[PDB]
Amino acid sequence: WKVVEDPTQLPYDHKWEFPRNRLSFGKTLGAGAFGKVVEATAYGLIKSDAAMTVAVKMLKPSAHLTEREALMSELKVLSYLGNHMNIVNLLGACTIGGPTLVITEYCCYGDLLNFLRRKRDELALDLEDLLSFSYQVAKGMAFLASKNCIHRDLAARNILLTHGRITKICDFGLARDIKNDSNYVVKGNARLPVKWMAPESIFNCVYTFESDVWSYGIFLWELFSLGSSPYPGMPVDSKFYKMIKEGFRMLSPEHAPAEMYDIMKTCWDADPLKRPTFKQIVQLIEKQISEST
Ligand SMILES: C[C@@H](Nc1cncc(-c2cnc3ccccn23)c1)c1ccc(N2CCCC2)nc1
DSSP: OBOOOOTTTSOOOGGGBOOGGGEEOOSEEEEOSSEEEEEEEEESSSSSSOEEEEEEEEEOTTOOHHHHHHHHHHHHHHHHHOOOTTBOOEEEEEOSSSSOEEEEEOOTTOBHHHHHHHHOOOOOOOHHHHHHHHHHHHHHHHHHHHTTOBOSOOSGGGEEEETTTEEEEOOOGGGSOTTTOTTSEEOSSSEEOGGGOOHHHHHHOOOOHHHHHHHHHHHHHHHHTTTOOSSTTOOOSHHHHHHHHHTOOOOOOTTOOHHHHHHHHHHTOSSGGGSOOHHHHHHHHHHHHHHTO
């Protein structure tokens, strides 16, 4: 991510310092080449001494100094952002006594992408459920933009679903295998989620709040498609780069309401400045949520 007008400039509040000995590691939730997320049990974290379930992000012994300092920066940013209902909230850290361990909220229903594909043909997902995730993810992204922060990888895979059908925006990062995930394309220097990126991001590497809105539009698409891959069954080749720059967008999903598709259209505008802000999107989804009463 970015902290636009530095992650190392951010300070570390030692109020998050939690001891390694009060964590009990369990089922590995996510795993990448240098890091992974583990579902651990933190004895005495919120209450005085009451056990709770957390997701501890950590690295494998194969991660070196840049990868380790990337994790300390991840931690500093989360500490800064603080709390929001619709983000995977930082619960504490272990920085002293060993390697970096970033202890965060655990979302029991895993990611939204796999949840949607499971729900695609334990409770049925209706239109009100999908509209809720639109509003919730929009609110969380509006809060990220509010704290002058930019995700750079907003997708249904990087959105988790917890109890009470609450979507929380997260980032696996080093904790996901970009090698085998075919949604990440090689670009001669690194692997990027091309299908979810804006033109300035693809052709200029300009990662601004505005580009995070095109990515949000791509999320709206897979959300309303109940899991479908953006530009499905399609290879991410040079032929792909032409029609996108031309102005070719995705067709409306079989379940997407009319107002929602208009939102994907303005998000998918060629001009990054003529795109809705995350705060304005909240008001539009609020409108459609009241219209349904
Ligand atoms: C530190 C990191 N922890 C994390 C990352 N990804 C997913 C989970 C996770 C929680 N529960 C489950 C269950 C199943 C699978 C995964 N998980 C936890 C993190 C990284 C960025 C982050 N944010 C918040 C502002 C934008 C990015 N929040 C948190």
